């Protein structure tokens, strides 16, 4: 049956050049006309570029500013995409879909997916994490303090407090990709007010990757 | 980008519907609106195209519309199945394609829930480093959608803004963060920096200062 296979994605440095593909199968190719699609982290659906059943058109997206180059070969039931000039918030997944057809005219909308392929554009390495402590603000009832788990690169970081003998409280959110290329997450316990002072609370933070490990006091 | 609510929500059973405010350059100057539904960790799928027409074998219960330069996606009798993101698109003046944001369906089934909001100003540490950043924190809402829109002062803040993806909690209620990056300059100019959660309707707001 109709299928796509997108490939080629992984790290990849700013500036760089790369080229994504998909595979078709269970349909014609050379009757259709092909786009990628692509999605950043968390954000919408973003048409990048179509080509023609022939390959002979091309249309792409103004707001790639020229960046990108789609192409296909009919005889490898293949299409492609590249790049120049990448950049860190180039880094999203990136789908192959297919333009439905027939008597063949293009009938305008996408009615073949992949499961796209994820390209992360970062020029770092392996890179540990900084830990600021995100201390309890003037408040007291419920106090909320917690550890800020900034500029590591790759995923992910596990974070426990007090060596796991803390659990209950404890929001340890997902991490976002910034403008640097590096990720930043955090984690939250909530504690009593009256507990300030007496208890002591520290986060344990293991980057598996750089092979970091760092305890940070958070306090008042 | 055409325009979508964030976020619309329906009980099982009952009648949604998710508009895509274009202009005429795109949903009003052509009749070629299509509406997909990407499912959590999945790969889009056509669901409506043409602007009412539905693809061979796609639930009857799916309908499309569109007056002037707005298109609508009409859900009858929600169904669980039918929670996930969904994205109108359109043919454009350019030959292009274009998207609109997306909206996510949910399919209440438990009560509403309104956020806990807490926002932390940048640490000592962090500024001695030469660094700044405000970490808005969001807990135990339901549903899971929530905009949040930054304020330095009283003016509005786009630039630095980066925020995740609701993420369900242990107690099936949602968690979202929001990150404002500042230079530490910026933070020491204004007077104040808010954050501000709109979640169904109504509007939580915190605040932080710089000394
Ligand atoms: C989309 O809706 C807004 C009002 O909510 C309006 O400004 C705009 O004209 C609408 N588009 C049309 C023509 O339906």
């Known amino acids: 049956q109709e299928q796509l296979v997108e490939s080629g994605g992984g790290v990849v440095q700013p500036g760089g050049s790369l080229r994504l593909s998909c595979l078709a199968s269970?349909?014609?190719?050379?009757?259709?006309?092909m786009h990628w699609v692509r999605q950043a982290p968390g954000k919408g659906l973003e048409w990048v570029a179509l080509?023609?059943?022939?390959?002979?058109?091309?249309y792409h997206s103004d707001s790639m500013w020229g960046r990108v180059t789609i192409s296909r070969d009919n005889s490898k039931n293949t299409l492609y995409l590249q790049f120049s000039s990448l950049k860190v918030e180039d880094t999203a997944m990136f789908f192959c879909?297919?333009?439905?057809?027939?008597?063949?005219?293009?009938?305008?909308?996408?009615?073949?997916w992949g499961k796209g392929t994820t390209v992360t554009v970062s020029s770092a390495s392996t890179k540990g994490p900084s830990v600021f402590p995100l201390a309890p603000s003037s408040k007291g009832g419920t106090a909320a303090l917690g550890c800020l788990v900034k500029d590591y690169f790759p995923e992910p970081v596990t974070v426990s407090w007090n060596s796991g003998a803390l659990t209950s409280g404890v929001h340890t959110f997902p991490a976002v990709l910034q403008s640097s290329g590096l990720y930043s997450l955090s984690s939250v316990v909530t504690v009593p007010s009256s507990s300030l002072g007496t208890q002591t609370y520290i986060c344990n933070v293991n980057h598996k990757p750089s092979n970091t490990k760092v305890d940070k006091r958070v306090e008042p | 980008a055409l325009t979508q609510p964030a976020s619309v929500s329906g009980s099982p059973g009952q009648t949604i519907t998710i508009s895509c405010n274009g202009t005429?350059?795109?949903?009003?100057?052509?009749?070629?609106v299509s509406w997909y539904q990407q499912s959590p960790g999945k790969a889009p799928k056509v669901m409506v195209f043409?602007?009412?027409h539905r693809p061979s074998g796609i639930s009857n219960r799916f309908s499309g519309s569109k007056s002037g330069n707005t298109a609508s996606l009409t859900i009858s009798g929600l169904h669980i199945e039918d929670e996930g993101d969904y994205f109108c698109?359109?043919?454009?003046?350019?030959?292009?394609?274009?998207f609109g944001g997306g909206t996510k369906v949910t399919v209440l089934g438990q009560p509403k829930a309104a956020p806990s909001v807490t926002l932390f100003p940048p640490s000592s540490e962090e500024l001695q480093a030469n660094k700044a950043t405000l970490v808005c924190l969001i807990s135990d809402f339901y549903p899971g959608a929530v905009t949040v829109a930054w304020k330095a002062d009283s003016s509005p803040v786009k630039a630095g803004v980066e925020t995740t993806t609701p993420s369900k909690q242990s107690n099936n209620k949602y968690a979202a963060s929001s990150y404002l990056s500042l230079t530490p300059e910026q933070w020491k100019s204004h007077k104040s920096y808010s954050c501000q959660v709109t979640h169904e309707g109504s509007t939580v707001e915190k605040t932080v200062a710089p000394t």
């Open positions: 879909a297919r333009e439905a057809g027939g008597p063949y005219y293009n009938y305008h909308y996408m009615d073949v």
């Open positions: 269970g349909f014609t190719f050379h009757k259709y006309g």
């Open positions: 080509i023609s059943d022939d390959g002979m058109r091309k």
């Open positions: 005429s350059s795109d949903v009003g100057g052509f009749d070629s």
């Open positions: 043409d602007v009412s």
């Open positions: 698109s359109s043919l454009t003046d350019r030959s292009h394609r274009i």
